[model samples]
Structure formats: structure tokens, C-alpha cells
Target chain A: AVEEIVKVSRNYQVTIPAKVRQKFQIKEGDLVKVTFDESEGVVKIQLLKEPWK
Target chain B: AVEEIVKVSRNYQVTIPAKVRQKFQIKEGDLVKVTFDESEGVVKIQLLKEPWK
Candidate 1:
């Protein structure tokens, strides 16, 4: 089972919870990269720019 | 390397390019599901919702 079941809003909008935001330190106007694994049918969201950068 | 370099836009939004959309039959307002396999560290996107539902 997954840790969370993020529900999409009416317009397919879902908020990234605060804890994750804090973990990632996502400030305003930041960009996240989403990669889809075609073979496994999975999606990954990563900080577009590396955290150390 | 990947087929295309999908640049993330200002709002952390990356448009799913044409070819993948066509291959997946993704609609305008469709809710594509994203599943992350933590053990494998792979992300999968599912067009249909059929997990432990």
C-alpha cells in the first residue's frame, strides 16, 4: 500500500503536502521534473535543479 | 538519453508531448494516475485506476 492517497481536485489539481515541500525546500516559482518510466508505468517527480545546486 | 527533452514550464508544468499522448490515448481532462515503486525507485503512470480498488 502507498503512504498517501492524494486526491485530485475538480480541475485535476493536487497539492504537494507541506512535509514534502519542506523536505524539498520548494520555494515559489520553482520547477519540478516529472519522468515517466514507460516500461514500469511509473512517474517520478524530482527537483528540476539538483538540491545541492 | 530520453526521446525528448521536456522542459518544465514556469508553473512546474510539463506538457505531455504529442507522441506519448497519442500512444496513451490521453484525453484533455483525463486523470492519469502516478504510482511510485519505492523499492525499485521507479515511477509508473497509469491511465486506468485499477490498484487495490
Candidate 2:
């Protein structure tokens, strides 16, 4: 099931609720990319590029 | 001489002015930290922490 997106605080910190982390397999210190799409009036966030090395 | 720091676009892309880049010795793909200090009522920008290899 798709998880609900959380709002980012003014400080730019968003708590990735536990369930979302489990589904995405996110771990501590994982870099995230947050993007704003003006055309769609929505923000998109994703895990940063992972090093293959 | 001090240079002007341009504002970020709605896309979060900011053109680092030539002079500022020269002064800071910044190169392409360098990470930067953007911080807003509520106490100081100022937004401070700095180069991101470089990892020591």
C-alpha cells in the first residue's frame, strides 16, 4: 500500500514515519532528494543516488 | 570586492555568480549548505562539509 506523504517542517525536516521507511528500505544517513514541481504544484522526494562502488 | 549572491529559482536552482565562485574556489558539483537562522533573522549559505578521503 502507498503511504501517506508527510509534511516538512519550516526547518525542512520531515519525519519519515516508520512504515514508509520499511516499505522503501530506507536506513539512517541515507541521502534524500526533495524536488518541487511548479507545474504540478507538488513536491516530490526520493532517495539520493546510491554509489555502486 | 564583494559579489551579489543570486536568489534560488522556484526550481531550487541558484546561479552561483562568477565572482563568488572565484572567491570561494568552488567547482562544479560541489555541495552547498543553505541554512536559515530564525534567531538571527538571516539565511546563511556555506559550502557543504567535505568528506575526508
Candidate 3:
């Protein structure tokens, strides 16, 4: 599994890693889908697409 | 059960229901984690908290 340490800013913004950003084509303002499992202590991030269109 | 329909904007932005947002205490600009279950055609959204202090 790929792993990396991310630092959160004072305002809670964390920079997405280069590999991930390239893989997902995430841009400066594109909204990303995030899943937080507090019990598991892990969060998942994915690119969101418009399902209907 | 509370249910609502949301209209997606041209940029694919969507509005979360007021009741659901209140129940989850969601705020504008908060990063939401979304799970897309393609097989089930379902998506789940929840608020994320910064795990590390």
C-alpha cells in the first residue's frame, strides 16, 4: 500500500500528494469526495463525477 | 424518513438537504467524504474531522 504523511494547515487544508493528484486528475478547485470512518481511523478520498450527466 | 432531491449545477455542484446538513452539522466549505457504491447506485456523505492534533 502506498503511504505518505500529510500536514494539515492552520485552516485544515491538507495538500494532496503529487502521485494521487495526477492519478485522479484533481485540480485546484475541483471538489473531491471524501469518506471518513472514525471507527477505523481512516479516510478515503476519490474524485466525484456527475452520475446523471 | 427524510428525503429530498437536489439539483446539480452546471459544474456538478450539489446542495445537501437542510435537514441532513443540520443533523450532521455540516458547514459550507467543509470537506465532505463521499462514498460511491457503483453497484448499488448509492452515495453516502459525512463530515470529516482532522484526526491528528
Candidate 4:
């Protein structure tokens, strides 16, 4: 399993890194669903849908 | 009122421009809620919550 990746910049910007994009084949216009689990203090993200070509 | 801003690139990467971010004061770790209205065919994005500093 791949580890959850996090990228933070000096300007306080967080970017979804290229490795995750390449692994998921996520392109522009893709819909991503993010959910938080209060109990575990964890954030979960899912690729909900893909855009039409 | 602010216009819906969209930025597309040749590599198919869409970047949220600095102006919009400045207008919204969106910083790192801020949660954005996104929803699609089927009838209007529009994507709505809202700033939901901010993570603790």
C-alpha cells in the first residue's frame, strides 16, 4: 500500500503532488470527494468521477 | 458579485488563480465544499472550515 502523501509550501499552500496524480490517473476536471473522520482525526479522499474527454 | 473564474492550461491542469485565493483569503488546510447543481449545470464551491493553526 502507498503511504498518504502531504506537500506543504512556504506560502501555506498545500498541493496534491504529481505522484498521487500519476498513480490515480487523475486529470483536470476530475471530481474528488474529501471526508473527515472526527473520531480518528483522519481525512479521507476519494476520486468520485472523471470528466468527459 | 464575483465572476466564476476558470483557468485551463495546455497540460490539462487547472490552477486556481491567485486573485480568487486572495479574494477568499483561502490558506493552506482550509476545507472547500464542492457541489454540483444538475439543473443549473454549475459547480458551487464554498469555504467550509479552517484547520487549527
Top TM-score prediction, candidate number: 1
Give lDDT tens digits, candidate 3, residues B2-46.
334333334433344444444444544454454444443334445
Better of 1 and 3 by DockQ: 1
- Models 1 onward score TM values of 0.44, 0.34, 0.39, 0.40
Lowest-lDDT window of 10 residues in candidate 4 chain A?
A1-10
Q: How does the DockQ of candidate 4 come out?
A: 0.07
> lDDT per residue, candidate 2, A1-53, as tens digits?
24242322233223445544445533344444433333432333344444535
- Per-candidate RMSD vs. true structure? 5.7, 16.7, 8.3, 10.2
Candidate 1 ranges beyond 4 A from true positions:
A1-53, B49-53
Q: Supply every candidate's count of residue pairs whose N, Cα or C atoms clash at under 3 angstroms.
A: 7, 0, 2, 0
Per residue, candidate 1 scores C-alpha lDDT tens digits across A1-53 of: 23333443354343455544444433455544555455755445554453435
Model 3, position A13, has a per-residue lDDT of 34
- Per prediction, the TM-score for chain B is 0.56, 0.49, 0.56, 0.60
lDDT of 3 at A39: 54
Instruction: Give lDDT tens digits, candidate 4, residues A26-47.
Output: 4455564443333433333344
Position A28, candidate 3: lDDT: 41
Against the true structure, whose lDDT is highest? 1
CAPRI category for model 3: incorrect
Clash-forming residue pairs, model 2 = none
lDDT to native, each model:
0.46, 0.38, 0.42, 0.43
Model 3 lDDT, full chain set: 0.42
Better of 1 and 3 by TM-score: 1
Question: Over 4 Å off in model 4, which ranges?
Answer: A1-53, B4-7, B50-53
